C-alpha cells in the first residue's frame, strides 16, 4: 500500500484527484504549522532579489510531523532533475511519497538539506518552463504514478472517410504484416520531424 502527502498553501488544487485503499492521498495546508497571528509562510530573500522565500521553520515542522525515515520527499522545482517515465515507475514502488509544494521564489534551501538528514530527497522539474508554484507539477507527477498503479503513431476511428480525410487504407486492409510496417514507418517519420534529438 502507498501513502501520498501533498503539503501546500492551496489545498483546493488537489481537489480533482480526490477507489480502493491501495493509495491514501492526503493534502495538508502548510499554514497549520505556523505560530504567528498572520499565519505567514514567507519572508524577504537574503542577498537581495525580487519576491519572497518560503520560511524553513514552518516547512521543517511540517516534515517532522508527516515524514519518516522511509519517506521519499519530492520537491517540485525548475532547478530539479527532469521528471520522466522511469522515475514514475521507480516511485510507484514507494510506500510513502511526500510532495512539498513551494510558491514565490521557492522554499529556503536548508529545508531540503535538513530533511535529507532523515529521509531521501529528490528535487524534480517536470520540464524546462516556469510555473507559479509546485502544485500543478505535483498533480502531473501523481497522475503518472497512479496511472502505473491503475513517438506514438496516429489513431483513427469511424467513419472511414471524414471531411474528405480518409483513414489510411492499410488500417482497413486486415493485413497484419502491412499494418505493422506502416506503424513503424509513421512513428519513425513523426520522431524525425518532431524529436530528431530523441
Curated annotation (Swiss-Prot):
The EC number(s) this enzyme carries: 2.1.1.228
Annotated keywords: Cytoplasm, Methyltransferase, S-adenosyl-L-methionine, Transferase, tRNA processing
CDD domains: TrmD-like
Compartments where located: Cytoplasm
Composition bias, Basic and acidic residues: 189-198
Residues holding S-adenosyl-L-methionine: 102, 126-131
Keyword S-adenosyl-L-methionine: yes
Enzyme class: transferase
GO molecular function: tRNA (guanine(37)-N1)-methyltransferase activity
SUPFAM superfamilies xrefs: alpha/beta knot (SSF75217)
Disulfide bond residue pairs: none
Main location: cytoplasm
Reactions catalysed according to its record: guanosine(37) in tRNA + S-adenosyl-L-methionine = N(1)-methylguanosine(37) in tRNA + S-adenosyl-L-homocysteine + H(+)
Database matches in Pfam families: tRNA_m1G_MT
Gene Ontology terms: cellular component: cytosol
Biological processes per GO annotation: tRNA N1-guanine methylation
InterPro entries according to UniProt: Alpha/beta_knot_MTases, tRNA_m1G_MeTrfase_C_sf, tRNA_m1G_MeTrfase_TrmD, tRNA_m1G_MTases_N, tRNA_MeTrfase_TRMD/TRM10
Family from the record: Belongs to the RNA methyltransferase TrmD family.
Assembly description: Homodimer.
HAMAP family per UniProt: TrmD (MF_00605)
Function summary: Specifically methylates guanosine-37 in various tRNAs.
Record protein name field: tRNA (guanine-N(1)-)-methyltransferase
Classification lineage: Bacteria, Bacillati, Actinomycetota, Actinomycetes, Mycobacteriales
Gene, per the UniProt record: trmD
Amino acid at each position: 500500500s502507498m501513502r501520498i502527502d501533498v503539503v501546500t498553501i492551496f489545498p483546493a488544487y488537489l481537489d480533482p484527484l480526490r477507489q480502493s485503499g491501495l493509495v491514501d492521498l492526503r493534502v495538508h495546508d502548510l499554514r497549520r504549522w505556523t505560530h504567528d497571528a498572520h499565519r505567514s509562510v514567507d519572508d524577504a530573500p537574503y542577498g537581495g532579489g525580487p519576491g519572497m522565500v518560503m520560511k524553513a521553520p514552518v516547512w521543517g515542522e511540517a516534515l517532522d510531523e508527516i515524514a519518516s525515515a522511509e519517506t521519499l520527499l519530492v520537491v517540485p522545482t525548475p532547478a530539479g532533475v527532469l521528471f520522466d517515465q522511469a522515475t514514475a515507475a521507480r516511485w510507484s514502488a514507494e510506500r510513502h511519497l511526500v510532495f512539498a509544494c513551494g510558491r514565490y521564489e521557492g522554499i529556503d534551501q536548508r529545508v531540503v538539506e535538513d530533511a535529507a538528514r532523515r529521509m531521501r530527497v529528490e528535487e524534480v522539474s517536470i520540464g524546462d518552463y516556469v510555473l507559479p508554484g509546485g502544485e500543478s507539477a505535483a498533480v502531473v507527477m501523481i497522475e503518472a504514478v497512479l496511472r502505473l498503479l491503475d513517438l506514438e503513431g496516429p489513431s483513427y476511428t469511424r467513419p472511414p472517410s471524414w471531411r474528405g480525410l480518409d483513414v489510411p487504407e492499410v488500417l482497413l486492409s486486415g493485413d497484419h504484416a502491412r499494418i505493422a510496417a506502416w506503424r513503424r514507418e509513421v512513428s519513425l517519420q513523426r520522431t524525425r520531424e518532431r524529436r530528431p534529438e530523441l
